[PDB]
């Protein structure tokens, strides 16, 4: 509706979802880094979480040998030296330098004095390093092909009680391993065994008793059982049975002793329940019973008592003047009764080789757990512990307190037999999600600890008095940590940027693998499941199908990450009956106590009138009444993610097949002319507006002009005097995405159309009218057409390839180097000798391909002339050279060439010359054209700025014959001074803005002329950007919108396709067998809705062609579409977009039911059966059955046939094994594996196996022989010893083995 739906009005189908607006999709990583990098003034730097906290915790250090402190005042964040648009091309680190304040003091002097001559601080400052400031779209550009950091889901810090499921048990008993997982430190395990004893299995190394751990803390021995036992009201020998005991625990126990009352009696021999005996004892002023022996007497008891509780007596020496049995058993099994022995045992467990010492062992345990420097348990860990086991306020303390271990042991021994449920280790709230913010904070803390160690080692040598500021602080490990985090980290491994949805789903991707979490193998079948608390916070359908399933599940559309780390999904809070509007993001930990009722419930005008609303009180869904309901779901799509929210009729799809469709929504290339789906989802507009590569109007003013490359916008309807002026949006042209695909933007706004702030001005890759459009809607017939779609393959019409509707660009952008080799500097001149003139075409004098010249597969791209030594002089080659008179070229051909493909044209050829000698004799015209275009765009920006400035000045002066004097823009030419002064101030501010722009442009041109950033070896690097125009050739993995994937079948002409009743031929002919097998019947419902929308569009466009803007057309649009009536004259433009089918925004779970689709088909002139008569195209006959012919939203998934095809008879071979390389990188060969060699082994094809893995690949002396034989004509070969067996016997011979052939 905000200039994005007015021309693409989507008839919504949700009942009434307006609980809470969904947050920004990229807001997860944005808000994460915005607590890791404040980037504001001093009062805004107060952040207990982020880089500031770790820095202030690691930066201040002391010197115990010289009394030198290194204080931290604050750090100042500077702007990035390179812009994102300029850093994407330079392929450098889009980072900003970190400036931190230093203060070294020597006040603490000797002679019992606290102030020295240099006691005053110096206020130093050191260049910490450059950190990759998060882009506005959340990309984290470290180099070319920007990689976004996926969030990680590691085990949240805190105590855990993983009750064993019988595995590793004696016979069938449980273990109840109480393990506290610290945020940064050593793990602790308090598991049990078959002997019913608690063992502190520290970090799963040894199984020493917990009594040693208690002795290490100091609270063990005669004081550890105080909270476990107590004194009994027993007496001594006297008349009868005298004892001042109170009966309070004798119920449900047989009367082993006659504990009858004193006067009358009680405690009968039955002892059934003691319901009356307890009441009588309580009402009789105490349960005075007149009565064991073999009990536990380990209570507090040195003159008459002794250590240990083992009497086996009848209380000799005047007695020394079934719920809990764990503590007494561990104290006896422990062989260490002294804290020193426990410390020695702990030291031997941790470091068995090192000899344990008295103070060394005590220091080891303290540094391990009692030290906050090593056992850095985050605040989230402490709060999680306080919630699991109740404790006092401990947010400040991080290390596990001595009282915390006691409470952990008590809760463990309580939960061993009931007394509260265990803490599931596979809970969403139990698994706190970490993002790029926390990950970078932890790795920067590690780097700062390394830098602190280096500074402590270096400060002992250099004195602090009269020392150069920041001379001992290093900067290598500071930036090295972030470089490794963005260079080869598992979390920063890649950024799926095939389309705006792939970026969002990749940014909102919680990967459970990587450093700090379980690897791909470590996952297992437990973490690869979906817990009930995952509902609303993490999508259960959108997940990779490969081995990493359940580990890289993306975050929900509404879910947010709290400050602690837990995922907080929104929940519309409701009172008794009446559901209020107050919403709160309830974390998964606090969601268990609260009862939740799902959305899509029939609520009345003021409350819910169902009284049997569905929902789940804690994970398990049940039928909760209207009352006793406090939390309600915000929207039905809260459970699905961004990539899954765009699946129309997703409630109809299968739980498994929707995972296939949700994964391909993010795996759809950006198509040219791609329009929004007719049966799309309302989430598409939000995902396209809250994604990257789409320019959003940051102002309210009206657009001035649009030329594709840029779009100028006025300031606003109410703009400040000199705040920002006009804001021009430089539209991103066809640049190679991270997936080697196109990223193009089109100025959807027209010249002279007012646009409010916050809306999408120009569409991004695969978008139309602001809405996300992964592909184009094509007429689909779900019928098996002549077997071309027998399997999941998808038949195709020529109209979907002839009209250029499913064609992308896929800019490869190959890279070439000119590194100075040891045998002379490598050259990039015109061409290498011994090359035909046909391949040298399309090359300028520099040697690179001309910008815009089509290059066939294998043609010369950049001539690389690499000097080397004299090649091996062969006699035949020397004779040939002497015969032809030529001379042997001393240089080897190394010019870059295009691999086998259909790339063709070249978009951009960027050259990065060395700073030393740049543009000397190569790439001069390239840099000249670059500076010419830069000056041209600068002049255009200056002209538009001057135009809008003159317009504003005229608007301001007209209110304060001006046409006869146009030169009075800077002078009033009258007696006025206040107005003239204000105009002069505004003009000087605008001139300062122009000067700042000119300064930025001159800095850019100076950086270009001085030499771009090049590696240390290569001096001239050419980055040729070749762009393809891949059509819909047979082989492209054109998958549907719901999960019905399939390779495109043979491209049938637009004549053989099945004819419709109106004469139109369907663009695709799918297979109906995919619906019954994989229950994705929503694809059929989605196709019916698309057919209804297409018929409505054909009816409206057929109604506008006869009468443009007719009085009756608005009536039909209102009947079909209420936010439709618009006072503007855009109705003539809205129908132009609706002619291709009126789009629909169907919710993920509140869309149109069967009755809604039926009514839509009736009102859209569609047959009520949903299908339609479809005449055959091949032969031509009315099919004797209703065929479904709708407008399905097909995609153009990146798994094409071009990027996946491969054929290499003989390519470059490896070195360790001399085998052909793998993959399509460099002429690879399909690896013939053990499981694929067994296919021929079981077969009689042993000659193939004697030539496929003997002479084909791993026979350097047999491969050439067989190739020469095949070229000669005879199909004979020979191969005795392959290179694989040779390297194997050489490796075995490397050891003490005697692998040696014989006879």
């Amino acid at each position: 509706q905000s200039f994005t739906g007015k021309k693409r009005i989507r008839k919504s189908f949700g009942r009434i979802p307006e609980a809470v607006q969904m947050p920004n999709l990229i807001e997860v990583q944005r808000s994460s880094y915005e607590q890791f990098l404040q980037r504001e003034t001093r009062p805004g730097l107060r952040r207990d979480e982020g880089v500031e906290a770790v820095f202030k915790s690691v930066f201040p250090i002391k010197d115990f040998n010289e009394r030198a402190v290194l204080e931290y005042v604050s750090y100042e964040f500077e702007e990035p030296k390179y812009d994102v648009e300029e850093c994407i091309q330079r392929d450098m680190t889009f980072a900003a330098p970190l400036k931190v304040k230093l203060r070294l003091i020597v006040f603490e002097t000797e002679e019992e004095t606290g102030a020295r001559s240099v006691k005053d601080i110096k206020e130093q400052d050191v260049y910490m390093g450059d950190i990759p400031l998060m882009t506005d779209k959340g990309t984290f550009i470290v180099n070319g092909t920007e990689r976004v950091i996926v969030s990680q889901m590691h085990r949240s810090p805190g105590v855990f009680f993983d009750h064993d499921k019988g595995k590793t048990h004696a016979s069938g008993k449980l273990l109840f391993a109480a393990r506290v997982i610290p945020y940064r430190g050593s793990w602790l395990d308090f598991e049990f065994d078959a002997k019913d004893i608690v063992y502190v299995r520290i970090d799963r190394r040894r199984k020493l008793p917990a009594t040693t751990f208690l002795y290490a803390l100091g609270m063990d021995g005669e004081e550890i059982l105080t909270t476990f036992y107590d004194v009994v009201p027993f007496e001594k020998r006297s008349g009868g049975w005298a004892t001042p005991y109170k009966p309070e625990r004798w119920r449900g126990v047989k009367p082993e002793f006659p504990l009858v009352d004193a006067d009358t009696g009680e405690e009968v021999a039955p002892a059934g329940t003691k319901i009356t005996a307890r009441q009588a004892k309580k009402f009789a002023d105490g349960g005075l019973k007149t009565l064991l022996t073999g009990r536990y007497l380990a209570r507090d008891a040195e003159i008459y008592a002794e250590a240990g509780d083992e009497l086996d007596v009848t209380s000799i020496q005047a007695l020394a003047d079934t719920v809990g049995a764990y503590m007494r058993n561990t104290l006896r099994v422990d062989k260490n009764a002294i804290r020193e022995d426990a410390l020695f045992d702990i030291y031997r467990v941790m470091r068995p080789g090192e000899p344990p010492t008295v103070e060394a062992a005590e220091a080891m345990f303290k540094s391990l757990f009692f030290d906050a420097e090593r056992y850095d348990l985050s605040s989230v860990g402490r709060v999680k512990m306080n919630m699991r086991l109740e404790q006092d306020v401990s947010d400040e303390v991080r290390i596990l307190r001595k009282e915390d271990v006691l409470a952990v042991l008590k809760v463990l021994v309580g939960l061993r037999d009931g007394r509260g449920e265990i803490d599931d280790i596979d809970n969403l709230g139990n698994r706190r999600v970490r993002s790029v913010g926390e990950l970078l904070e932890n790795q920067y803390r590690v780097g700062l600890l390394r830098m602190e160690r280096a500074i402590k080692e270096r400060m002992s040598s250099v004195d602090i008095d009269t020392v150069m500021p920041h001379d001992l602080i290093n900067a290598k490990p500071a930036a090295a940590a972030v470089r490794e985090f963005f260079g080869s980290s598992q979390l920063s491994q890649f950024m799926d940027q095939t389309n705006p949805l792939s970026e969002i789903t990749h940014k909102r991707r919680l990967s459970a693998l990587g450093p700090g979490g379980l690897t791909r193998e470590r996952a297992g079948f437990e973490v690869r499941d979906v817990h009930p608390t995952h509902y609303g916070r993490i999508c259960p359908i959108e997940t990779p199908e490969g081995p990493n399933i359940g580990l890289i599940n993306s975050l929900a559309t509404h879910a947010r990450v709290n400050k602690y780390g837990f995922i907080e999904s929104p929940y519309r809070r409701v009172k008794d009956g009446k559901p209020q509007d107050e919403v709160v993001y309830m974390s998964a930990m606090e969601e268990s106590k609260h009862v939740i009722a799902q959305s899509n419930i029939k609520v009345a005008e003021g409350e819910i009138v169902e009284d049997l609303v569905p929902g789940r009180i804690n994970g398990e869904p049940t039928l909760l009444q209207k009352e006793t309901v406090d939390l309600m779901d915000v929207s039905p799509r809260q459970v699905v993610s961004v990539a899954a929210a765009l699946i129309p009729f997703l409630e109809n799809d299968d739980a498994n097949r929707a995972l296939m469709g949700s994964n391909m929504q993010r795996q759809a290339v950006p198509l040219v002319q791609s329009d929004a789906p007719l049966v799309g989802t309302g989430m598409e507009a939000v995902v396209a507006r809250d994604s990257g590569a789409v320019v959003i109007a940051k102002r309210t003013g009206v657009v001035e002009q649009i030329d594709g490359t840029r779009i100028v916008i006025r300031a606003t309807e109410e703009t400040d005097p000199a705040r920002s002026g006009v804001d021009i949006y430089r539209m991103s042209k066809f640049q190679r995405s991270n997936q080697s695909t196109c990223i193009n933007q089109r100025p959807l706004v027209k010249v002279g159309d007012r646009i409010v702030a916050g809306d999408i001005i120009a569409d991004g890759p695969s978008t139309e009218l602001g809405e996300l459009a992964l592909g184009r809607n094509a007429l689909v017939a779900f019928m098996p057409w002549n077997g071309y779609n027998f399997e999941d393959s998808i038949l195709i019409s020529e109209r979907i390839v002839r009209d250029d509707v499913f064609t992308s660009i896929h800019i490869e952008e190959f890279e070439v180097m000119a590194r100075d080799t040891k045998l002379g500097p490598e050259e990039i001149t015109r061409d290498i000798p011994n090359v035909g003139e046909e391949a040298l075409r399309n090359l300028d004098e520099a040697g690179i391909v001309a910008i815009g010249a089509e290059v066939q597969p294998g043609d010369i791209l950049v001539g690389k002339v690499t000097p080397k030594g004299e090649s091996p002089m062969t006699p035949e080659e020397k004779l040939l050279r002497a015969i032809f008179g030529e001379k042997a070229s001393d240089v080897r051909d190394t010019s870059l060439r295009l691999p086998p493909g259909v790339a063709g044209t070249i978009v951009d050829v960027r050259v990065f010359n060395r700073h030393g000698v740049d543009k000397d004799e190569r790439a001069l015209a390239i840099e000249r054209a670059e500076i010419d275009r830069l000056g041209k765009d600068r002049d255009d920006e200056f002209a538009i700025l001057n135009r809008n400035i003159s317009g504003r000045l005229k608007e301001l002066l007209i209110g304060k014959l001006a046409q006869v004097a146009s030169g009075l823009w800077w002078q009033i030419a009258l007696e006025d001074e206040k107005a003239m002064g204000e105009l002069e101030s505004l003009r000087r501010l605008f001139d300062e803005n122009r000067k700042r722009l000119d300064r930025r442009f001159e800095d850019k041109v100076d950086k270009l002329q001085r030499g771009d950033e090049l590696p240390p070896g290569v001096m001239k690097m050419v980055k040729v950007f070749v762009a393809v125009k891949r059509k819909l050739q047979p082989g492209d993995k054109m998958a549907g919108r719901h999960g019905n994937k399939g390779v495109i079948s043979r491209i049938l002409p637009i004549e053989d396709m099945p004819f419709l009743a109106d004469g139109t031929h369907v663009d695709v002919v799918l297979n109906p067998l995919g619906v019954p097998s994989r229950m994705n019947v929503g694809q059929i419902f989605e196709t019916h809705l698309g057919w209804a929308c297409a018929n409505l569009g054909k009816q409206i466009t057929n109604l506008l062609e006869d009468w443009q803007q007719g009085g009756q057309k608005q009536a039909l649009v209102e009947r079909l579409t209420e936010e439709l009536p618009d006072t503007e004259e855009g109705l003539v433009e809205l129908a132009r977009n609706l002619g291709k089918g009126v789009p629909i925004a169907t919710p993920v779970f509140d869309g149109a039911r069967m009755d809604d689709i039926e009514g839509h088909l009736e009102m859209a002139g569609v047959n009520k059966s949903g299908q339609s008569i479809l005449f055959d195209g091949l032969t031509g006959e009315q099919f004797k059955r209703p065929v479904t012919v709708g407008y399905i939203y097909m995609l153009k998934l990146h798994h094409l046939v071009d990027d996946k095809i491969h054929a290499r008879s003989i390519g470059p071979y490896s070195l360790v094994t001399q085998q052909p390389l793998g993959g399509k990188a460099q002429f690879g060969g399909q690896r013939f594996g053990e499981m694929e060699v067994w296919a021929l082994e079981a077969y009689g094809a042993a000659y193939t196996l004697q030539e496929m893995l003997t002479v084909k690949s791993d026979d350097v002396a047999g491969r050439t022989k067989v190739y020469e034989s095949i070229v000669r004509g005879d199909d004979t070969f020979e191969a005795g010893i392959p290179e694989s067996f040779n390297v194997l016997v050489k490796e075995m011979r490397s050891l003490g083995l005697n692998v040696e052939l014989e006879n």
Partner: protein
Amino acid sequence: QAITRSIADQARTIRIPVHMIETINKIVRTSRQMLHEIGREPTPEELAEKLAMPLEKVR
């Protein structure tokens, strides 16, 4: 002296000479001090004159 004499040999996998190891250490120390005091990373041609050595040798 023994660690610096041996670390300079059995650490690069190519047995870089001791004097070349000390030269590269001096170069990296100069680059670090320049990043700390002067500002951005200096060009490789500037490091040749910053240490009073041949320009081609530093390259």
